[PDB]
Every structure is written in C-alpha cells, then in structure tokens.
C-alpha cells in the first residue's frame, strides 16, 4: 500500500557492481563511475565504463517474487557497557498473606508482602536489613514500597 507507485517510483537505487568482496558492517557511498577494463575513464560515462547505481521499477501488479519487501534486521553484540533494553513477558497476579517465591529483575528470595509506612526514593530497588535481609522492594509500575 505505502511503497509502490502507479507509473513508477524512481526514488530508490541499488548498487549492482563492486570491485571486490565487501566486509560485513560496511557502508560505501560512491559517485565514482565503475571502470570495467583497461581503458581509463574520467567520470563521464563512456565506452565500457558504467554508472554503478541501478533504478527500481515499482508496480502492484507484478506478483510474489517481484514485489518489494522492506527488511530491517536487529544486531546484538557484547561490549564493556552493561545490558540496556530488556523484556516484558507478562506478569502474574499479586497476592497477599502467603509465603511466596520472589522473581524480580535484581531480587530473588522468599517472604510475605505486607504494607510499609517507610519513606522511599523513586530511583531505588530493594531496601536492606541490619539483619542482612531484604525487607523492602520498589514496585516499578506503580510507585510504592
């Protein structure tokens, strides 16, 4: 619907020729005219020296192999920085007055969730104990402890 155009769409080009095999994750932009042989060319399009970028022709009536397909891929890698964008996988119902098992982002354990009158920070994660126990947690969706 939003891609093809009646009586042509001239906006996109593809590069058909390259002198060697490209490395992965490499972008080349070139106005340089491709030289196919021993005869030199100064950047005008001459005999056996040809312009590398070739046009697309867009029409809805082609069928399945000649339609355009917009492709975006995701690249994942590891670096010195910690992991940034993580995942929602739906959540269960919150229950009270039962000894449960903890599954959080940074917190594992067990306990019974009761109300807390303590003053909290919006930034924080879990509160501690002198008894060396985690006695509180900040809920990220609605701000309470």
């Amino acid at each position: 619907k939003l891609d093809s155009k009646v009586s042509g769409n001239y906006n996109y080009l593809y590069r058909l020729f390259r002198k060697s095999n490209l490395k992965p994750f490499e972008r080349d932009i070139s106005t340089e005219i491709y030289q196919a042989g021993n005869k030199p060319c100064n950047g005008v399009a001459g005999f056996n020296c040809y312009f590398p970028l070739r046009s697309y022709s867009f029409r809805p009536t082609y069928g399945v192999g000649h339609q355009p397909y917009r492709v975006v891929v995701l690249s994942f890698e590891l670096l010195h920085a910690p992991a940034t964008v993580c995942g929602p996988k739906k959540s269960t119902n919150l229950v009270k007055n039962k000894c449960v098992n903890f599954n959080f982002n940074g917190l594992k354990g067990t306990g019974v969730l009761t109300e807390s009158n303590k003053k909290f920070l919006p930034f924080q994660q879990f509160g501690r104990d002198i008894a060396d126990t985690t006695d509180a947690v900040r809920d990220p969706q609605t701000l309470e402890i």
């Binding site: 003053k119 930034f123 924080q124």
Partner: protein, 252 residues
C-alpha cells in the same frame, strides 16, 4: 568564532576550604539504618579548594583532569551553564559537549574545533565551533526553564554536578538545595549515567554573558573545582534513608 573576548581580566588563584559537604550515595541499592563501609572515589574533608569569583573580572583557567573532580556552583544571574570535555580539545579527538541552549540540556559526543575562550551569547545564536564531524553519542535529558536576566545581590540557590570517571562510565550526581560559602550537609542522588568510554584529560568552564564583542557583560557568580582520591568512608542512614553525616578515617 575563533576570536575570543579580549576585555577579560583574571584573578590570582586563591584557595578556600570545604567542611561538612561533598557526600553522595555510593550505591544504587537502598539501605536503611545501618552503618556501611564502602570504597569508591571520594573527597577528603578539610582540603584546599580553589576560589573562583566571576563579576570585567572573569575566572576561566585551563585545568587538567586526572582522577576525579567536583563542580559546586552557586548562582544568581545564571552565569555558569555547562562544561566542555576532551583530551586535546580539537577535531583530532572526541569531545564531550554538555551545554544548555535553554530548551533542553544538550549532550553530544562529536569532534568540535574549539577556540581559546568559548562563551555563550535572551540567547540569540550559539556557535562555539568552526566545524563538526564524526558524531557518536546522543542523549535527550529533561527540559528546564530559566531566566538570563542579570541580577546582583544575595545568592538564593546552589547548583551541584559531579564529573567522575570509573572504567569509562560517567555518572552525574545532583542535589538542588536553597539556603559566599554556605554550610550544612547534602546528599546527592544519581540521575544521568553516561556509557561513553572516552579518554578525557582536560576540561574548561563555559561562561554565559548577557547585555559586537564590546557589549557583553556578566553578573556575580562563583564555582569550585576540587580533586578526588580513592578513600574509604563510613555511612549513616536514618529511617527515611537520607545521609546526615559521613566520617573520613584518615583525618583525626
């Protein structure tokens, strides 16, 4: 662009001290009513901090960066805005530009070609550089509003920023409190973490002036530049979770 302000006059670098402040939260994990022993990059108390006073008198020296610094700003007419960072401060290396155009705080890592004395000149046109190429990091912060109108008088607010580098990470600590040298204790909460990872050996302080090169003047403002050391402290927490006091071990 390249031609700086020739009407400036510099003060000699006299030294002052700091007493009870400079304490930040070392960890993201909240703890309550304990006494915690941590090891991070801190400031030893009762040290020497260089006095700066900006009033045609301007203080903008060239200072190196080694381990860590503080910036404690006290403002009236909002002179000191942001800071520029980098190694050789040119287009040969990457540079951290933190500046506010009074829409949002602009944090960009690109290669800018700096002049000798860059300045910020309401605000009409902001150009500190001749050219820009090879940008890396872009960030959009929370917007703020302020007034550029010059006032001379008593100082009603404090402005805090912490520039530190641990393993390439840059964390910004900020606490906004109202009241030459105010006192009391402050607890600086973390806000913006920067995963940049570039080598910065030198900084410079940007100055904003109000009312081609003759008619720009400024109000009364002051800032502090400290040095840091990996010193072991203690912590104190109440039931609310705010730090009242911190104890340096190697002093007394």
């Amino acid at each position: 662009q390249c031609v700086n302000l020739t009407t400036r006059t510099q003060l000699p670098p006299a030294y002052t001290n700091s007493f009870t402040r400079g304490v930040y939260y070392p960890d993201k994990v909240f703890r309550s009513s304990v006494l915690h022993s941590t090891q991070d990059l801190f400031l030893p108390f009762f040290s020497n901090v260089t006095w700066f006073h900006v009033i045609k008198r301007f203080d903008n020296p060239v200072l190196p960066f080694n381990d860590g610094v503080y910036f404690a700003s006290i403002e009236k007419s909002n002179i000191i805005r942001g800071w520029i960072f980098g190694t050789t401060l040119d287009s040969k290396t990457q540079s951290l530009l933190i500046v506010n155009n009074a829409t949002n705080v602009v944090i960009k890592v690109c290669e800018f070609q700096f002049c000798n004395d860059p300045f910020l000149d309401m605000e009409s046109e902001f150009r500190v550089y001749s050219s820009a190429n090879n940008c890396t990091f872009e960030y959009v912060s929370q917007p703020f509003l302020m007034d550029l109108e010059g006032k001379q008088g008593n100082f009603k607010n404090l402005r805090e920023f912490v520039f530190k580098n641990i393993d390439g990470y840059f964390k910004i600590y900020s606490k906004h409190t109202p009241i030459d040298l105010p006192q009391g204790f402050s607890a600086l909460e973390p806000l913006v973490d920067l995963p940049i990872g570039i080598n910065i050996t030198r900084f410079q302080t940007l100055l904003a002036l109000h009312r081609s090169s003759s008619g720009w003047t400024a109000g009364a403002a002051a800032y502090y530049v400290g040095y840091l050391q990996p010193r072991t402290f203690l912590l104190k927490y109440n039931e609310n979770g705010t730090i009242t006091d911190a104890v340096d071990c190697a002093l007394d």
